[PDB]
Design a protein around this nucleic acid. Sequence first.
RNA 1: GAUUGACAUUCUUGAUUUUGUGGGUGGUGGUGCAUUGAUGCCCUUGUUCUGGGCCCGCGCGCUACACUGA
Lengths: 251, 278, 21, 51, 26, 95, 49, 216
Amino acid sequence: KVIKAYTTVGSILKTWTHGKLPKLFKVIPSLRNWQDVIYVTNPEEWSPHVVYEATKLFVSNLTAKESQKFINLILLERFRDNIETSEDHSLNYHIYRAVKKSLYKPSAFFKGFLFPLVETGCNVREATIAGSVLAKVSVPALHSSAALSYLLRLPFSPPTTVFIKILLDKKYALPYQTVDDCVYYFMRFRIGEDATRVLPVIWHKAFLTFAQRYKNDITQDQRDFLLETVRQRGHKDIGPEIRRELLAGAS
Amino acid sequence: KKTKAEVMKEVIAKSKFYKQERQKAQGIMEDQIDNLDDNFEDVMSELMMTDLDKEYDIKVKELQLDKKKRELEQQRLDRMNGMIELEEGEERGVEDLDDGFWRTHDALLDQVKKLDLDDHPKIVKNIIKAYQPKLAEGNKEKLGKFTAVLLRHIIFLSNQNYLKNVQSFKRTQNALISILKSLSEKYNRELSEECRDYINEMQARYKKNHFDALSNGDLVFFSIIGILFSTSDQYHLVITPALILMSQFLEQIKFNSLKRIAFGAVLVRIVSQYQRIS
Amino acid sequence: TDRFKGDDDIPYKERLFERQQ
Amino acid sequence: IPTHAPKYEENFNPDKKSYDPDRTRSEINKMKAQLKKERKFTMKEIRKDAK
Amino acid sequence: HTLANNVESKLRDDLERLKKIRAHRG
Amino acid sequence: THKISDKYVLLNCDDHQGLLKKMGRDISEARPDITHQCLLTLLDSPINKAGKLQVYIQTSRGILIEVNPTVRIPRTFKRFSGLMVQLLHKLSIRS
Amino acid sequence: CVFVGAMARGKDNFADEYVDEKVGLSNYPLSASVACSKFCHGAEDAWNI
Amino acid sequence: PVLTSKDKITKRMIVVLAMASLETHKIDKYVLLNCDDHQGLLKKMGRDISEARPDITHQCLLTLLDSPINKAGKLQVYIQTSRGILIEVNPTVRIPRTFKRFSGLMVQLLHKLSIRSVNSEEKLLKVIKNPITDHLPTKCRKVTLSFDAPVIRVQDYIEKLDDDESICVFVGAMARGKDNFADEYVDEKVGLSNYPLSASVACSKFCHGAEDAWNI
RNA sequence: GAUUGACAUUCUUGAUUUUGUGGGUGGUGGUGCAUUGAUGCCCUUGUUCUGGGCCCGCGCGCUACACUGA
């Protein structure tokens, strides 16, 4: 179980202000029952430096099993509860520091906070601020293209496609997984997501500027059927920029 | 008095925050000192012990195997107007008009491209300069030394002897002067320093001898600096000591022959070229 | 002095000096 | 015309003394004055007591 | 720089004792 | 001026509600700002820059205040009012 | 000399013991700064400034 | 005496002050630019101290009611700052006379932008966008007040050309800075008097020469 | 062996990274339009602890300030 002082530790680390990881939490990754320990501790320990150092240590000690052990159950609902109790649906400075310290594990944190974002009613400003705190730093390339093709061969959602817009307007390199990802999105964009959901320029921010410095190793026939897509979709804002934006892939 | 009451309230809340922080710090120190030694004992006494990666491997192999214009249209006029305003501020401008004071060294680039004179030597040195600019990430001052050595070498190969192809050599030197301006637009910071090196060189030669220890490299040096450089600034480090150098070249010695007479004639032509616009 | 005046401050300079002392 | 700036002090009170430049003699100017008025006060009061 | 100030404060406290042994509301 | 307690405060129309009636006169004519603006334009005039003037301002209370041509009046109004009681009490200010 | 009044409203009888030439700048409502600036500019044009 | 800028039949007078500074600061604490009450934020933000002066236009308001051709109403003024707010004037306007009332009139800068008179009809101060030659014609003689050209007086300058449609002037308001004098409309600059002058006395020189040439 | 919390210089993880080139400099907004429909304009890079002005005046002599000067 515990030392039965973790209720006192939770009561003081809910409103802690200045300090570092104590003798318990410095090796609480190196313990074994720390799942049950932090469960009965009931992590309302939302003090800024405790949150920052705690996410620092268990993302230093986060595997995939550890992610599915102490990520999914309570932190998503805590984000939903603080964006509910705030009127503008905004996160905090310690949330930002937690993401900025916790992003640097490549394939564990994606299944941590990015992939379960589509679970229970994702939202516009919150997915925008999540893409902000996920894209202010470098993203690993292979796991980034994996996450992009994963959440785009997952079904459509507007706060998910906002993150897709951010991830493809990051001005990032291109593998063939993103090539055939664009191919199957082309095959989905017939009359299909185009029939059931009209997309204005807000969701077409991906498709206004798409391939400025991206391909450079492939032909322009996928560009040709993207052009037949943008000529099948009648719009005045987007058209003549698609040629001078999309013809960057040389051969 | 209401401001003083709110000031006492804020000071009381700050003292309460400091007391709470001190009490929490002492309680956390005592709890972390007296809890962990049996917390580890309890945690060890109780018997306590994919597709994203696949798509990442596929995209990793796929990315490791193969390993508008209105803004940039008016950017040229923006930088040109910036050049013009800095040119006029350099005409009557910048340097305060005061102070009242009353990867080589000149041989290794030639040894590297030492097969031809003009075409193949500058082409091989251009390819080597492209490779050095690509692979020079921690040595850009050595790229600056490389550009200065290339400038010095290209000046003393632009003037050697005209028994060769006169028109084709003039063609390749026009192309050479154009690419030298194209790199002088990018790099100047030791172009000016090697210009001082050549001013000291010709000053030592001019105090050594009148005219017989004077090569024709001064002609092509003055030509390249007054063709690439906007020579219309008030005081510059480069041109102004070279201006009084060519002034003493024009009015120091006895021009005994038609070679020095033609030297003076092309000097008058080149100073009209210099200060046509000033 | 063409089209302007002088400018100085209150005892915050002495407050900065007392913080420096 | 050669132009100069008038020296003065903000929130100028004639009853208060002026802005002392030198802190090393500001307190001795305050005290060599206070001392004199307090000396006059104590001598006046003890001689009124004596009478 | 300090002899004047501390002998001044000491004699001021001395005259304050002179005022304090009597009542002498100032 | 008015020594209120604290220290001086000038007499404008806009710096209070009823100090004009408190002293016993009218707030409609409590007008020193036209004096400040008029004197600063007379000082910044080019004939004053050539030095062919001397400006005697006065009040209703019989006083006579001479300013030189070389006076740099403070450009604001708050610094001018801070200079005004220095003039009205010390009767002489330096360069 | 000009005895320019800094009055807000009233009668300019303050110097009715030495001043003779009752003269102004217009019959318009002006400001006092404009009145003295008109007289100083008239002195400039009179005395070559 | 009535006059809008669509009064193309006869000669007018235009005064434009350039490169001012009035953009209200918001700490619900609601202030405009000044240089006496608040300066710690003005020295922390990096802006220059002596440029911050609405007293320049608060003392330039003599040009609102100086001209004795108010029986025709010849004057129209315009201000310019880094924001670019412009202000049309009435020759028989009722200006806030003192600095604190003109300074309380800051929602006109910030968010009100449209004030009306007692009959709720005449927009006394109008904030129509740049340029000025949309309102006055191109028949206005090109002078800006600067500090380098030989001086030519405003009387002779007006009585030179008789029946052009407007006259204009561009004055500067700074501590020291080369204003954008003759790049937008002006080409040739007229120098001021033979001493360093201020903005209010430059406007006074221009309007006194203008009224003395028009003979009122 | 590039580097992460470190039994306060220590073994404990590890591709998350090292010297320079650019461009995105900064979107966690305020704002005009149904309660979320690029619709004009602005700015860029939240935090351990921390702050007081106040209820001497009068005047008598003596003395300095003036080519009548030194």
